[PDB]
Design an enzyme around this catalytic site. Structure first.
Site, mmCIF file in Angstrom:
data_model
loop_
_atom_site.group_PDB
_atom_site.id
_atom_site.type_symbol
_atom_site.label_atom_id
_atom_site.label_comp_id
_atom_site.label_asym_id
_atom_site.label_seq_id
_atom_site.Cartn_x
_atom_site.Cartn_y
_atom_site.Cartn_z
ATOM 1 N N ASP F 57 0.497 -0.846 0.115
ATOM 2 C CA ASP F 57 -0.295 0.073 0.279
ATOM 3 C C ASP F 57 1.174 0.790 0.279
ATOM 4 O OD1 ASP F 57 -1.857 -2.500 0.194
ATOM 5 O OD2 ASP F 57 -2.518 -0.999 2.042
ATOM 6 N N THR F 90 -4.445 4.432 -2.520
ATOM 7 C CA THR F 90 -3.536 5.130 -2.208
ATOM 8 C C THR F 90 -2.922 5.824 -3.569
ATOM 9 O OG1 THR F 90 -2.572 4.282 -0.864
ATOM 10 C CG2 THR F 90 -4.055 5.427 -0.078
ATOM 11 N N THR F 91 -2.269 5.039 -3.962
ATOM 12 C CA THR F 91 -1.037 4.662 -4.738
ATOM 13 C C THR F 91 -1.400 5.079 -6.149
ATOM 14 O OG1 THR F 91 0.073 2.438 -4.095
ATOM 15 C CG2 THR F 91 0.883 3.234 -6.229
ATOM 16 N N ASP F 384 -8.211 -3.476 2.852
ATOM 17 C CA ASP F 384 -8.734 -2.704 1.423
ATOM 18 C C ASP F 384 -9.794 -3.192 0.287
ATOM 19 O OD1 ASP F 384 -5.998 -0.991 2.453
ATOM 20 O OD2 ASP F 384 -4.534 -2.583 1.257
HETATM 21 N N1 LIG Z 1 -6.642 -8.231 -13.498
HETATM 22 C C1 LIG Z 1 -6.353 -6.768 -13.880
HETATM 23 N N2 LIG Z 1 -5.753 -6.323 -14.471
HETATM 24 C C2 LIG Z 1 -5.889 -5.742 -15.602
HETATM 25 N N3 LIG Z 1 -6.155 -4.428 -14.492
HETATM 26 C C3 LIG Z 1 -6.253 -4.407 -13.323
HETATM 27 C C4 LIG Z 1 -6.527 -5.335 -12.854
HETATM 28 N N4 LIG Z 1 -6.011 -5.597 -11.292
HETATM 29 C C5 LIG Z 1 -6.562 -4.336 -11.336
HETATM 30 N N5 LIG Z 1 -6.101 -3.539 -12.466
HETATM 31 C C6 LIG Z 1 -5.575 -1.599 -12.396
HETATM 32 O O1 LIG Z 1 -4.928 -1.379 -11.732
HETATM 33 C C7 LIG Z 1 -5.249 0.007 -10.996
HETATM 34 C C8 LIG Z 1 -5.334 0.039 -9.732
HETATM 35 O O2 LIG Z 1 -5.121 -0.993 -9.269
HETATM 36 P P1 LIG Z 1 -5.683 -0.944 -7.107
HETATM 37 O O3 LIG Z 1 -6.019 -1.952 -7.180
HETATM 38 O O4 LIG Z 1 -5.836 0.602 -7.596
HETATM 39 O O5 LIG Z 1 -3.649 -1.100 -7.287
HETATM 40 P P2 LIG Z 1 -3.574 0.030 -5.775
HETATM 41 O O6 LIG Z 1 -4.206 -0.062 -5.182
HETATM 42 O O7 LIG Z 1 -2.218 -0.505 -5.619
HETATM 43 O O8 LIG Z 1 -3.684 1.284 -6.195
HETATM 44 C C9 LIG Z 1 -6.795 0.256 -11.707
HETATM 45 O O9 LIG Z 1 -6.943 1.258 -12.300
HETATM 46 C C10 LIG Z 1 -6.988 -0.958 -12.535
HETATM 47 O O10 LIG Z 1 -7.493 -0.095 -13.456
#
Ligand SMILES: Nc1ncnc2c1ncn2[C@@H]1O[C@H](COP(=O)(O)OP(=O)(O)O)[C@@H](O)[C@H]1O
Ligand SMILES: Nc1ncnc2c1ncn2[C@@H]1O[C@H](COP(=O)(O)OP(=O)(O)O)[C@@H](O)[C@H]1O
Ligand SMILES: Nc1ncnc2c1ncn2[C@@H]1O[C@H](COP(=O)(O)OP(=O)(O)O)[C@@H](O)[C@H]1O
Ligand SMILES: [Mg+2]
Ligand SMILES: [Mg+2]
Ligand SMILES: [Mg+2]
Lengths: 96, 63, 121, 144, 44, 518, 75, 43
Positions: F57, F90-91, F384
């Site tokens: 995170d 948050t990232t 989360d």
């Molecule tokens: N299985 C997946 N296939 C394609 N894109 C994904 C997948 N899982 C997540 N993403 C992309 O990753 C981005 C950020 O994911 P997130 O869960 O917010 O990561 P973090 O929690 O580190 O910010 C999202 O905008 C989403 O479009």
């Protein structure tokens, strides 16, 4: 026939360190001992291993060297999980 | 030299004496030199016009 | 209430300037210094907004001397008209008054200092 | 701690070979999952109690300690300790019922299973009336 | 063939992963001696 | 002159700016590798007590690392409050906030546009982005089956970046089943995280009822069938009487022995008041002394002591009853019932497992793993996931993920870029390139070509279709509805709104005043 | 950047700041190719070879020889 | 207006202000040495 298969070859090669370490602690030559592990196992499907008292290869069930399956199961399982966590590390940053 | 040293690290873990490791590369090095000396071809039979081109082959390689 | 944004400053600057040459005396330079001191505010607004202070200051002085309407100032947002009736800007009289009172009353104290002793900590 | 370092040594040369770490990681999880299925075919079931297998297994499993050569009488001691707690559901036997009291003195050969509950603390000896009791009724006082 | 579709920048994760592997294996070399019946004991 | 004094760093309009942007670049490059499913986790080493922390995170990475840069402290605080609001994303705020400033650095240098003019483009660009984000959403919750499926897809999308990416097919059932058991109650305090060493990551199993780490008394039995549960925030300890200021004047010790008899008779009558209900267990908040403990033996009552404040509400909601302290009127305060009160052991610590309760409004996620660093990652990962899915119950609208939300928002921004006259239209396009840079980074972390997939995705969506997205497993464009990738509407709304405010604060700077530290 | 400016000062005696600002801007423009687009360094220089070759060819045709008249060369 | 050139640089005008005050400081040191009413300066 894949790159995953090439990793499994190294998985099989690195798993042979346990009888290699037993050979060095006992003073026996590892290649001569491990060569006997390969020579006896194609026919002997189980209970073939190293005995430290005679300093050689023999049937371990007759000599009564047994252990639970959960010990070896947890070793292979927890070892793979630790390598899974270490290889995902990329940076070492100092913090408070 | 580092590639020979990196592969020698795995063989030291197996418990091979270093002299047997060193003697193995000495026999393997001369065996590889003896094979590569047979397979390579000679260029002295060609004339001077083609011998200049062989220098251009190596000159572009080194630059 | 009043209408600030450079309109009150240029209105109050020319008022003292028109009285400076009537009351020459010896304090006419102080009236001119007070006039030019008020002009720094709309020139600062012209400097921050990117407009030319020459055309901005000359337009306000020339226009406000001609016309009696005293709600034209420096348009900083870049509108086409400088009349502040349409731009929706209003300020209080007590607020704009205290800028001149607390400034002119402080600077009397600042100018009356001659000896300045600072004990090092 | 040795198999982990060995697999890291396998992953060391594989990082230079242009393979991703996630592909290397998933390969071990799939390979480890297949390793469990191979041992499930090889392992043999045993009875609820078997002195031939349990005593020999306990002796040959220690194998590195100081009491390994003393295991001729301590391996039955470990088997007899666990066999008193038995269940068909294959429960996780708690080791709180098996207390290991440490007393400095003597030798390891004098170690033996006490039939009753051994107390670690000594007597008060402020009055010192009784010396040795026989056919005594024990009570546990929690108040003062 | 070459000069297409990628270029591997930020090779410090590769250097960090190598440092972590040799650091873990160096600790494992001290624990490796205590394996098996012919292992030895450690005083700390 | 020197008014500020000795040891005071000051900067003016070329050292002030370009120190925040390089700080925004410095804080953004750290969290660049953590974004996406193929992202690498960062390890944090503490300066004291040799405490390590494995975490993905971005908020937790910025919590621990010290950062004396004032511009980086803005990114530290916005990730903190973003973790407080939603818990996930948050990232994306830190990356989008840094890239917005990276673009604005070029507009100030190359195009020579005022900073206030850049903000006015971002206000219209952000308004067009949120309007497209609102219209791109879709309703839900009318069919419980579709609402069940969308929570499974949101759990898969959330845990794809965490350590549970391989086992998300199993953890999605564990994540979504606990949320539906809440019965609409949005609160994370009703979910326990029990740390157990051993096993593997996929050994986490769904628990029926409620499980906690407590123990019976000294003399209590192992199993009681159909046990009535009670919860006392009472003092079964040395009660005293509460008019502090009571003392005992004693003329002779004859009545003092009878006074102590009255104290034991006082607590005996209090335990006799418990037996009027005829309960089978007794749960107390604080420690139970031995004399109450012995009285529950003959009456056939179990005893559990030293319950946490959160554990009272977590156990009471599953039981269905209410916390009782007076014990006066047996008419009201109807208690629940539990079938199996038998404890189990998972590792070296026994846990009291319940099963067959009236309601399951509180839950407990049992986790298994190798290292505590992995369990800490398991805690932060599912926290989360459960935080996003819990807020999805109250906020029903969702939006497609997989990078399609970023490009579909930039479509309306690019459409509204042409009809805006002046120099702020370039800043409106700079906002569009900032949205485009997120899927550019998703392809970099996966190791595939970024310019081709971004160009193919950008050209595909302008054709008329709006369901395409990035498939990083195969490395090509695919249908997001088939893969089942969807995220909440409030998440991306909070990210775009927070990132717009993040660039606005740091772009309105001209001087830096760093006073002397204490 | 110090040495390329010293050679330009000794060779021609003019255009040193143009070399300093252009050579820095080429590295500035090459920075985003390395970071954003992820171009190989050998590809960036390979394009600059063909781009510089076409650049000098433009000056071959864009030049004008005023040697035929001294009055025009004087001008 | 918004389309005006900000020019990105306030350091040049600040350096010119620092030079003018530094130049006026020494100019005001020798102001009282001008004319018949001037004073000598022993260094
Ligand atoms: N299985 C997946 N296939 C394609 N894109 C994904 C997948 N899982 C997540 N993403 C992309 O990753 C981005 C950020 O994911 P997130 O869960 O917010 O990561 P973090 O929690 O580190 O910010 C999202 O905008 C989403 O479009
Ligand atoms: N939209 C506008 N149009 C014209 N003038 C404005 C506008 N907004 C602010 N101003 C002028 O700029 C001045 C700015 O004052 P302000 O900075 O808000 O107070 P302070 O200087 O105490 O912070 C005001 O006195 C007002 O006359
Ligand atoms: N009056 C002018 N009108 C148009 N261009 C001019 C004028 N004066 C100078 N320039 C341009 O400015 C540039 C000045 O370059 P210069 O400062 O001589 O470079 P360097 O100092 O590195 O030798 C020239 O290329 C010229 O084309
Ligand atoms: Mg053992
Ligand atoms: Mg996430
Ligand atoms: Mg010149």
């Amino acid at each position: 026939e894949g790159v995953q298969a090439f990793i499994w070859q190294e998985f099989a090669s690195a798993l042979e360190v346990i009888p290699t370490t037993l050979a060095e602690n006992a003073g026996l030559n590892s290649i001569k001992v491990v060569t006997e592990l390969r020579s006896k196992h194609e026919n002997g499907e189980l209970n073939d291993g190293i005995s430290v008292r005679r300093s050689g290869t023999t049937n371990t069930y007759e000599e009564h060297i047994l252990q639970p399956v959960l010990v070896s199961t947890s070793a292979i399982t927890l070892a793979s999980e630790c390598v899974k966590s270490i290889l995902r590390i990329d940076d070492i940053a100092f913090s408070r | 030299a580092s590639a020979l040293l990196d592969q020698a690290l795995e063989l030291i873990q197996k418990g091979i004496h270093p002299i047997k490791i060193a003697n193995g590369f000495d026999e393997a090095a001369k065996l590889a030199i003896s094979k590569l000396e047979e397979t390579c071809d000679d260029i002295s039979a060609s004339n001077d016009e083609l011998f200049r081109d062989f220098l251009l082959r190596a000159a572009k390689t080194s630059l | 209430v009043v209408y600030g944004g450079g309109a009150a400053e240029v209105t109050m600057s020319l008022a003292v300037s028109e009285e400076a040459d009537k009351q020459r005396g010896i304090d006419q330079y102080a009236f001119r210094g007070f006039a030019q001191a008020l002009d720094t505010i709309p020139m600062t607004l012209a400097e921050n907004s990117g407009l030319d202070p020459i055309g901005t200051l000359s337009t306000l002085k020339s226009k406000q001397l001609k016309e009696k309407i005293s709600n034209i100032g420096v348009d900083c947002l870049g509108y086409g008209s400088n009349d502040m009736k349409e731009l929706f800007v209003v300020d209080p009289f007590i607020g704009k008054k205290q800028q001149i009172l607390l400034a002119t009353q402080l600077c009397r104290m600042i100018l009356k200092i001659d000896n300045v002793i600072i004990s090092g900590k | 701690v040795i198999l982990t370092g060995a697999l890291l040594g396998a992953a060391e040369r594989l990082l230079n070979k242009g393979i991703h770490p996630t592909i290397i990681a998933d390969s071990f999880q799939s390979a480890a999952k297949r390793s469990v299925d191979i041992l499930l075919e090889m392992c043999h079931k045993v009875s609820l109690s078997d002195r031939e297998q349990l005593v020999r297994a306990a002796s040959t499993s220690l194998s590195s300690k100081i009491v390994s050569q003393y295991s001729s009488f301590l391996a039955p001691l470990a088997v007899d300790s666990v066999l008193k707690i038995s269940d068909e559901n294959s429960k996780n036997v708690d080791l709180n019922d098996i207390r290991l009291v440490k007393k400095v003195g003597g030798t390891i050969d004098d170690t033996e299973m006490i039939d009753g509950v051994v107390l670690t603390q000594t007597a008060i000896k402020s009055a010192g009336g009784p010396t040795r009791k026989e056919k005594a009724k024990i009570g546990l006082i929690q108040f003062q | 063939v070459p000069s297409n579709a990628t270029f591997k920048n930020k090779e410090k994760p590769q250097e960090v992963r190598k440092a972590n592997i040799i650091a873990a294996r160096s600790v494992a070399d001290a624990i490796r001696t205590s394996l098996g019946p012919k292992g030895m004991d450690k005083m700390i | 002159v020197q008014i500020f004094g000795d040891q005071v760093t000051e900067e003016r309009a070329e050292n002030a700016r370009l120190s925040a942007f390089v700080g925004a670049i410095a804080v953004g490059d750290l969290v660049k590798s953590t974004l996406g499913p193929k992202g690498m986790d960062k390890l944090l080493q503490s300066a004291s007590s040799n405490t390590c922390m494995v975490t993905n995170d971005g908020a937790t990475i910025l919590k621990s690392i010290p950062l004396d840069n004032p511009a980086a402290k803005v990114l530290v605080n916005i990730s903190k409050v973003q973790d407080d609001e939603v818990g996930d994303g948050t990232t994306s705020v830190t990356v989008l906030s840094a890239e917005l400033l990276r673009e604005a650095e070029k507009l100030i240098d190359q195009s020579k546009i005022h900073p206030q003019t850049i903000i006015e483009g971002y206000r219209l660009a952000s308004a067009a982005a949120l309007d497209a984000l609102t219209k791109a959403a879709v309703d839900n919750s009318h069919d419980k089956t579709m609402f069940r499926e969308d929570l499974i897809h949101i759990a898969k999308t959330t845990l794809s970046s965490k350590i549970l990416s391989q086992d998300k097919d199993h953890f999605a059932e564990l994540a979504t089943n606990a949320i539906l058991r809440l019965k609409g109650s949005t609160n994370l305090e009703h979910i326990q995280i029990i740390k157990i060493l051993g096993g593997k990551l996929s050994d986490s199993f769904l628990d029926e009822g409620f499980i906690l780490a407590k123990k019976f008394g000294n003399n209590q039995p192992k199993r009681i069938e159909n046990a009535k549960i009670l919860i006392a925030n009472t003092t079964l300890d040395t009660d005293k009487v509460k008019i502090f200021g009571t003392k005992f004047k004693v003329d002779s010790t004859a009545k003092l022995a009878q006074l102590e008899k009255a104290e034991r008779e006082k607590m005996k009558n209090k335990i006799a008041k418990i037996s009027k209900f005829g309960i089978n267990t007794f749960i107390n908040r604080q420690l139970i002394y031995d004399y109450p403990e012995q009285l529950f033996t003959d009456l056939g009552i179990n005893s559990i002591e030293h319950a946490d404040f959160e554990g009272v509400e977590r156990l009471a909601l599953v039981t269905g009853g209410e916390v009782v302290s007076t014990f006066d009127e047996p008419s009201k305060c109807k208690l629940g019932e539990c079938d199996v009160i038998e404890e189990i052991m998972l590792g070296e610590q026994p846990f009291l497992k319940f099963s067959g309760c009236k309601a399951g409004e509180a839950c407990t996620i049992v986790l298994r793993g190798a290292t505590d660093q992995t369990l800490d990652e398991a805690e932060r990962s599912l926290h989360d996931a459960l935080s996003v899915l819990s807020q999805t119950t109250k906020e029903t609208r969702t939006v497609l993920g997989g990078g399609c939300a970023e490009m579909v928002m930039s479509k309306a921004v690019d459409t509204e870029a042409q009809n805006i006259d002046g120099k702020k239209s370039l800043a409106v396009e700079a906002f569009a390139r900032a949205l485009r840079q997120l899927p550019t980074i998703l392809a970099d972390n996966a190791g595939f070509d970024s310019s081709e997939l971004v160009s193919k995705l950008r050209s595909s969506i302008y054709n008329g279709i709006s369901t395409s997205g990035l498939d990083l497993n195969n490395g090509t464009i695919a249908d997001m509805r088939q893969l089942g990738i969807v995220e909440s509407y409030k998440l991306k709304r909070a990210v775009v709104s927070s990132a717009s405010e993040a660039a606005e604060v740091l772009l309105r700077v001209d001087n830096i005043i760093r006073a002397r530290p204490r």
